[PDB]
Amino acid sequence: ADERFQALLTNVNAVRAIADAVEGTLGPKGLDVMLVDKFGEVTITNDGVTILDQMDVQHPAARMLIQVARAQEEEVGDGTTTATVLAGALVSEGVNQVEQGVPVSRVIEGLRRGVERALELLRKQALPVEGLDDPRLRAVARIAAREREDIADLVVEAARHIGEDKLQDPNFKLADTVTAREGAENQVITVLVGAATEEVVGERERVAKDAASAVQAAIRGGVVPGGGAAELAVAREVEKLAEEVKGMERYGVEAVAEALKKPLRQIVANAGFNPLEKLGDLRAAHRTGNDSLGIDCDTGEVVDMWEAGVIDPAPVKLHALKAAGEVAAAILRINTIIKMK
Amino acid sequence: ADERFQALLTNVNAVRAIADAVEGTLGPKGLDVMLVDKFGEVTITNDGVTILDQMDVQHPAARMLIQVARAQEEEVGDGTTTATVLAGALVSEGVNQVEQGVPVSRVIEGLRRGVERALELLRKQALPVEGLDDPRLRAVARIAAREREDIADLVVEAARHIGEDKLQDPNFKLADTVTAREGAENQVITVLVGAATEEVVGERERVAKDAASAVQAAIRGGVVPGGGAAELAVAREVEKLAEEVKGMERYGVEAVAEALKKPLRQIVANAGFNPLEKLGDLRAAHRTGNDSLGIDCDTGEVVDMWEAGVIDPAPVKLHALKAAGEVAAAILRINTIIKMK
Amino acid sequence: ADERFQALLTNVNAVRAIADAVEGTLGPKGLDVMLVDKFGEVTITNDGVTILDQMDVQHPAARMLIQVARAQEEEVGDGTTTATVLAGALVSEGVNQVEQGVPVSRVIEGLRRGVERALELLRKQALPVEGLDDPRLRAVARIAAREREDIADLVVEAARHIGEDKLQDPNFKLADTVTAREGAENQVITVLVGAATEEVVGERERVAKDAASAVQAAIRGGVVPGGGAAELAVAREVEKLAEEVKGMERYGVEAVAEALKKPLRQIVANAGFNPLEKLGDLRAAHRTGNDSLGIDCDTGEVVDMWEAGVIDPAPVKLHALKAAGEVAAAILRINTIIKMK
Amino acid sequence: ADERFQALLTNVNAVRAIADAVEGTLGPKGLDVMLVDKFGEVTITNDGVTILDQMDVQHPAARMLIQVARAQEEEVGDGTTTATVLAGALVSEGVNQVEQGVPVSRVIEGLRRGVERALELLRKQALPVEGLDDPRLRAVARIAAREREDIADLVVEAARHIGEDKLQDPNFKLADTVTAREGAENQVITVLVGAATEEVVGERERVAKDAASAVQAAIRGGVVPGGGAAELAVAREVEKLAEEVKGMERYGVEAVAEALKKPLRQIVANAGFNPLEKLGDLRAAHRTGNDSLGIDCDTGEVVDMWEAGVIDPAPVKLHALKAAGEVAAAILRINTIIKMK
């Protein structure tokens, strides 16, 4: 019986290691990682899609988390860091509950329903955007642009150049229509992203792709309050369902409720504030009945996220949460480790 | 800085060790404790008063807890076990919150307000007695008599002889009017408590005092749905206070919210049941708007505590929680250890 | 003499180890197992057919168990995991009896007679299916298809198309008449099973044959209550046998009696409930004289097996118990281990 | 949690060691025990009272068992060995069930109900004696007299001298009226028991009192098939009850059912036969439905105990089983050890 738990705990540590490396890059004030080789080259990066693509993974269970994370990229092309962090948080809280005495099978079925209601509420709370002239598209473009307005303006201009129904096509991907060249300017003709030298093209094309996918998802799925505020808004209701669920199976719902707060906690931690008090003081304005406010990362004061302009696409967070729940369930479902024939 | 926390942990572990050796006697299906000497004498007792009286204490933090608990006993003559267990839980999760990074003063000042609202709501939940012929006095005598009916009837029979307005006299302690003699019968004259042999006189005398004090308090303060149900009922509202309180300080209100679960948790655990599943399944019937429901100690089925016939006095629980809060606040405040002259 | 028993004990622990690896996959809420290579590839599988194919078996006592398990798979293509988890229980209880002082040769014939009367009573308890219009066909198809109704419907829709006497042909195998192709829909023309991608065909083709074999076995041998309830039912009759067998040899009949409870015990354990408490109350529900009372696998309350709708074919369990008896007999007779040229 | 169980295991081993030190003296072919000192003085004896009154006890769990076992002697004056061995078996099986996962409080109440049930069936099964000249009164004195008829005959000769109603009172016991003097012949004047030398007076007086108590009990409450047959008779009924108890509580009832077989197991083991086979062929002979079959101590052939004459009085066995159940419960309750002032 201890060996079965040790099998799960060994897999959990592999997942937590992947989340540990990529959870420091969350939010608008994230931190970058160092990637080194035996030959000695360096790759400074803060975009998690590059971190997961260019990380040495040897433990068998870690590969599944990256597989789902890049499946999300195949879907819409953004939000892999959030999915990895949520999956790590879910698995960590699940193993914490199992160590408390809950059987793993009960935690899995609790986690399933918790993620189900969380997706339901995130879908409900997503507010649609009225036309491409709305400033919320500028807001969601700037945040995907790493707070560089020069790239941000040319993607939103291109979006209004194309149109609404042409953007609604599911067979068309805007990320295939972005190209970056060196020594050029920023304009739309297929858009051209200017770069200084050849080495600057690689990251500029990446951020152009990210902004393209953000504005792509914004029109179809609407708008959700970013910065982890939506996660807290759904976490409160998931806790209500945890009080609603009967039996030992509820403690998976509590695990989903706690795991949903990890994005906001890591955003405030990366912003250079103490998470445990900034999470406490954030609950003051959540008593007012409005569930669209969080914390800004520059002054540490509680402010509503519509006015602050910290916005996230609805499909990115919805799919990130779905993938995180699916992989957390899949990695919790393992009980034994065996060597092949 | 670690030395200031190290001194807190040693104070905590002394308090915890007192509670771990007393908490097993809580509830109707409690278990006894064996006490040994260098001479090897045996003292089998399940009453917390005697175990706390005769137990060796060397760590100064432990002495304060039993001084507070026995002053509580000097007040009304019962409830020391519940107070000690509650103090242990409060101190344990006080240090648990500090381990997470919360400052100690914030936890202290959160414990203060949590205990304040818990006392207020336990006062408001206490239901008064409608005359002394009410069967709930039979119930509160029966639980105080270790579920032995021969002691349960004579204390209520004597009490109805005394009356009411003579019973509310604060200078009158009814537990001083009990005397047990070997080989006698059961009657009032002074309630004469029969016993088989001389050695049996001590435990019967102690049980007579316990039942006498229970019925004494039942008229003064009314009744509360016991078995840990009332502490759960006020724990829910203390959790609402925690969601109402601002800043880092709210983590102490959460500590009070959890510490009120420990009596019911350890009542269920001592019954031979899994406390996790039974605490999970007990929140179902609390959604109906009623807050007077608990769990039985024989079948494991969730039943209403008024009809289940398990009731405890109001002042005993009130003052036990007050003493537990006061001693938790007094013991979390210490930060350093120095030798004297 | 110690060497003879030690040479047996090393054989038992091999059958125990291979049984332990697949015991977690039993039941509708089973847990998957990952199979790592030297090169690091992984196969997540919850079916017991594949885990035995793709695992090292170096201690040759396990080779006999895998050989007889796949030999069992050859007739009716299902229930190999039940066969090996019953074999492990029988062998473990037999060696436990041998530890008490019973010689092995007595336990061998006790096992023989107990398994014989267990086969007799599990055959008798089987209830024939009323045509192909009976919804028990849907019930037995859904369970074999991992509780996925989309694949469950097509197998029984085809089975309607084949007929009664054409399915009753012993030389005709309907598991060869199921084929899976990627990118297609589900229809019967040959049963075509749809799949998303090429990698999804590998598992869909497997579960198609499993579901096909379930409905094939159902017509031949009728229906038996699943979830381990039938093994619990025949266990009591084996216990009644044990009191009738004269001499030291009966204790093998006790080994059969205790081993037949292992399926229900492990299905309950994998479900996330306590096996002892949830198996004790089952026999308390057997007072009515009916032998179908089993346990639901998400609420944990005892429920009559037929009405829950989770039901398993009769011949698969018949031959699984026969194979478990054959291998438990075969392994126990091995007393010495030596080498060749 | 481990310490609470380890505190029980040290208490269990003390009881087991006491029972293990007097288990070989049970039955008509019992084996003596050698006591030693620092001075080297030694006493050879097989009367368990003379061992338990003299062997050294330092673990306080053993002193309670000897206290209640000698209280049984104070009540009647015989059957202390069976009380001790039953207490040991009950405690050993209680801890065996706690090892599996049953909480101690559940086993405790299961044991309580099992012992109450066993007392009820022994009360029913104990048939009365028809007059004083019935040969079973000769037989009970014979077994009480270490299979020597010289002491047995004078006891029944005195018993007819006193009278039936004179024996019926509780205020008078003829265990005190027996007196042994050296150099005297066997006659009654005061039952004068002859002895060879002064040293022979001690054990002869002791066995005279034992035989006196045996025939006291025989008229007082009748007779019960001894040699362990009656405990096997009631153990089947306790096993039948075990299947009716709901939930986790039953495993105490199974412990009571098993612990009642330890008496006959030890009579057979001390006799020089394999207990496991001679229990199987005994329970295989109970097909007729009668509850008087046992095993003879000279040939090992299964015979009815009435014809063999091996008989034991009813009240001694009833009180021994009651004391064994009470002490097993009271030693199972203990879960924590502390040093006192």
Residue numbers in the entry:
A (entry chain N), B (entry chain E), C (entry chain O), D (entry chain F): 12 to 200, 356 to 507
Sentences from the paper on this structure:
Chaperonins are essential protein-folding machines, classified into three structural and phylogenetic groups: Group I (bacterial GroEL), Group II (archaeal thermosome and eukaryotic CCT), and Group III (bacterial thermosome-like). All chaperonin monomers share a common three-domain structure: an apical domain involved in substrate recognition, an equatorial domain containing the ATP-binding site that drives the conformational changes that occur during the chaperonin functional cycle, and an intermediate domain linking the two by relaying signals. Using ancestral sequence reconstruction (ASR) and protein resurrection, we inferred and experimentally characterized the last common ancestors of these groups (ancestral chaperonins ACI, ACII, and ACIII). We selected several AC nodes for protein synthesis and purification, including the last common ancestors of Group I (ACI), Group II (ACII), and Group III (ACIII), along with the ancestor of the Fibrobacteres–Chlorobi–Bacteroidetes (FCB) Group (AFCB).
In the case of ACIII, oligomeric structures were visible in the absence of ATP, and they all formed double-ring structures. ACIII assembled as eight-subunit double rings without ATP-Mg²+, and AFCB formed 7-subunit double rings. The 2D classification of particles of the four ACs revealed that whereas ACI and AFCB formed heptameric rings, ACII and ACIII assembled into octameric rings, mirroring their modern counterparts. Regarding their overall structure, a typical chaperonin double-ring structure was observed for ACIII and AFCB. By contrast, ACIII and AFCB did not require ATP for either assembly or stability. Group III chaperonins, found in some bacteria, resemble Group II but lack the nucleotide-sensing loop present in Groups I and II. The remaining chaperonins E. coli GroEL, ACI and ACIII exhibited similar hydrolysis patterns. AFCB and ACIII showed similar patterns, with a small initial increase in LDH activity before stabilizing at ∼75% activity after 35 min. The evolutionary progression from an exclusively single-ring structure in ACI, to a mix of single and double rings in ACII, and finally to an exclusively double-ring assembly in ACIII, suggests a gradual, step-by-step evolution from single- to double-ring chaperonins. This pattern supports a timeline where ACI is the oldest ancestor, followed by ACII and then ACIII—with the latter likely arising through horizontal gene transfer between an ancestral archaeon and a Firmicutes bacterium rather than being a direct descendent from LUCA. For Group III ancestors, a notable increase in total stability appears to be driven by strengthened Van der Waals forces and reduced backbone clashes, indicating enhanced hydrophobic packing.
